[PDB]
Scaffold this active site. Structure first.
Site, PDB file in Angstrom:
ATOM      1  N   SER A  47      37.577  30.404  38.639  1.00  0.00           N
ATOM      2  CA  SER A  47      38.269  30.223  37.369  1.00  0.00           C
ATOM      3  C   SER A  47      37.946  31.297  36.333  1.00  0.00           C
ATOM      4  CB  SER A  47      37.927  28.838  36.779  1.00  0.00           C
ATOM      5  OG  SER A  47      38.694  27.783  37.367  1.00  0.00           O
ATOM      6  N   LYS A  50      40.757  33.551  34.928  1.00  0.00           N
ATOM      7  CA  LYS A  50      41.719  33.104  33.926  1.00  0.00           C
ATOM      8  C   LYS A  50      41.530  33.807  32.578  1.00  0.00           C
ATOM      9  CE  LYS A  50      42.263  28.804  36.356  1.00  0.00           C
ATOM     10  NZ  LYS A  50      41.392  27.645  36.689  1.00  0.00           N
ATOM     11  N   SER A 111      40.770  25.297  31.966  1.00  0.00           N
ATOM     12  CA  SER A 111      40.627  25.819  33.322  1.00  0.00           C
ATOM     13  C   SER A 111      41.681  25.244  34.254  1.00  0.00           C
ATOM     14  CB  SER A 111      39.224  25.551  33.868  1.00  0.00           C
ATOM     15  OG  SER A 111      38.902  26.480  34.897  1.00  0.00           O
ATOM     16  N   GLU A 147      45.728  30.640  42.430  1.00  0.00           N
ATOM     17  CA  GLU A 147      45.041  29.373  42.626  1.00  0.00           C
ATOM     18  C   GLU A 147      45.528  28.673  43.887  1.00  0.00           C
ATOM     19  OE1 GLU A 147      42.516  28.409  41.387  1.00  0.00           O
ATOM     20  OE2 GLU A 147      42.306  29.399  39.416  1.00  0.00           O
TER      21      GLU A 147
HETATM   22  C1  LIG Z   1      37.872  27.064  38.264  1.00  0.00           C
HETATM   23  O1  LIG Z   1      37.009  27.736  38.862  1.00  0.00           O
HETATM   24  N1  LIG Z   1      38.342  25.827  38.791  1.00  0.00           N
HETATM   25  C2  LIG Z   1      39.313  25.006  38.129  1.00  0.00           C
HETATM   26  C3  LIG Z   1      38.668  23.719  37.659  1.00  0.00           C
HETATM   27  N2  LIG Z   1      37.764  23.954  36.540  1.00  0.00           N
HETATM   28  O2  LIG Z   1      36.408  24.087  36.933  1.00  0.00           O
HETATM   29  S1  LIG Z   1      35.612  25.089  36.101  1.00  0.00           S
HETATM   30  O3  LIG Z   1      35.114  24.549  34.738  1.00  0.00           O
HETATM   31  O4  LIG Z   1      34.406  25.601  36.865  1.00  0.00           O
HETATM   32  O5  LIG Z   1      36.387  26.355  35.863  1.00  0.00           O
HETATM   33  C4  LIG Z   1      37.907  23.029  38.799  1.00  0.00           C
HETATM   34  C5  LIG Z   1      37.211  23.935  39.814  1.00  0.00           C
HETATM   35  C6  LIG Z   1      37.827  25.319  40.023  1.00  0.00           C
HETATM   36  C7  LIG Z   1      38.929  25.376  41.106  1.00  0.00           C
HETATM   37  N3  LIG Z   1      38.781  24.734  42.350  1.00  0.00           N
HETATM   38  O6  LIG Z   1      39.968  25.999  40.927  1.00  0.00           O
END
Ligand SMILES: *C(=O)N1C[C@H](NOS(=O)(=O)O)CC[C@H]1C(N)=O
Length: 279
Positions: A47, A50, A111, A147
């Site tokens: 993430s 982003k 996120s 993603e």
């Molecule tokens: C980002 O890495 N992701 C999106 C979501 N937010 O988690 S975060 O706070 O670590 O960024 C969940 C995990 C992850 C994903 N699987 O895309």
């Protein structure tokens, strides 16, 4: 007084013997160069990219190709399924449109994976963002997947990678306000400050209320390992000056609580190093 001997040694005791590969970038406001740890590793971003994506979306906004109040079609059945998305729980209905501005806030602050993948469509995919990262003069990083592709294949995450130098450079190019208009800059800073993600990471051992603009990232677990537990951000020191810290915990066999404690402890050491220089 830049990176000096007890800072590099505090970092030394925080990672030694930990069953992980820890990337570190510390760039205090008096340093000519970042202090780096594991500078030659390729750290999967998850993430964290982003932030990079938002900078490209807001640069295309600054160039007029997009607009913050421009509407985007979000179709509950069409978008990336079974994923983390506060947007697809905040908004009811089988189809609705949200503004690019709310896509940005969802991707950066919450996120959000759906919002993030829709912004990838509007800018020309991962290849658009890979070119933008290079265009800032950042070389040692790559983005090839979105993603949806990362959710489809857990080994694909390793190719959306950054070096610690490249992590410092993007944090610096964000923090210095020169890559975006004043309106676009101020929205990105707000979204990065106002997130509630990763409270135990960069913010975990800082005094309550310390202003930290940051982006987290985390993979899932596999066979008792976590490929990535990341946090990259700008700490506002008590004099108002920026302290850049990025920590990427790669392929860890430690518990999640230990992975985040590692991030937190590095940020604290860098922070306290800077605090003794003032009052
Ligand atoms: C980002 O890495 N992701 C999106 C979501 N937010 O988690 S975060 O706070 O670590 O960024 C969940 C995990 C992850 C994903 N699987 O895309």
């Amino acid at each position: 007084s830049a990176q000096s001997p007890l800072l590099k040694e505090q970092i030394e005791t925080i990672v030694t013997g930990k069953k992980a590969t820890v990337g570190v970038a510390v760039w205090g406001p008096d340093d000519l160069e970042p202090l780096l740890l594991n500078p030659f590793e390729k750290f999967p971003m998850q993430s964290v990219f982003k932030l990079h994506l938002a900078m490209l979306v807001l640069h295309q906004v600054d160039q007029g190709k997009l607009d913050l109040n421009q509407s985007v079609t979000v179709n509950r059945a069409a978008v990336l399924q079974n994923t983390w998305s506060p947007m697809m729980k905040d908004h009811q209905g089988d189809e609705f449109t949200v503004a690019v501005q709310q896509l940005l806030q969802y991707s950066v602050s919450h996120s959000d994976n759906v919002a993030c993948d829709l912004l990838f469509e509007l800018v020309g995919g991962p290849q658009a963002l890979h070119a933008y990262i290079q265009s800032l003069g950042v070389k040692e990083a790559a983005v090839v997947a979105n993603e949806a592709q990362m959710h489809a294949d857990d080994q694909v995450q390793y190719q959306n990678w950054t070096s610690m130098k490249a992590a410092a450079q993007v944090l610096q190019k964000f923090e210095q306000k020169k890559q975006l208009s004043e309106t676009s800059q101020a929205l990105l800073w707000k979204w990065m400050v106002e997130t509630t993600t990763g409270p135990q990471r960069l913010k975990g051992l800082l005094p309550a209320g310390t202003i930290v603009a940051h982006k987290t990232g985390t993979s899932g677990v596999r066979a008792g390992k976590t490929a990535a537990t990341n946090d990259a951000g700008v700490i506002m020191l008590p004099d108002g000056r920026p302290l850049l810290v990025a920590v990427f915990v790669k392929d860890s066999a430690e518990s999640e609580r230990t992975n985040e404690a590692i991030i937190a402890q590095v940020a604290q050491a860098a922070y306290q190093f800077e605090l003794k220089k003032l009052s």
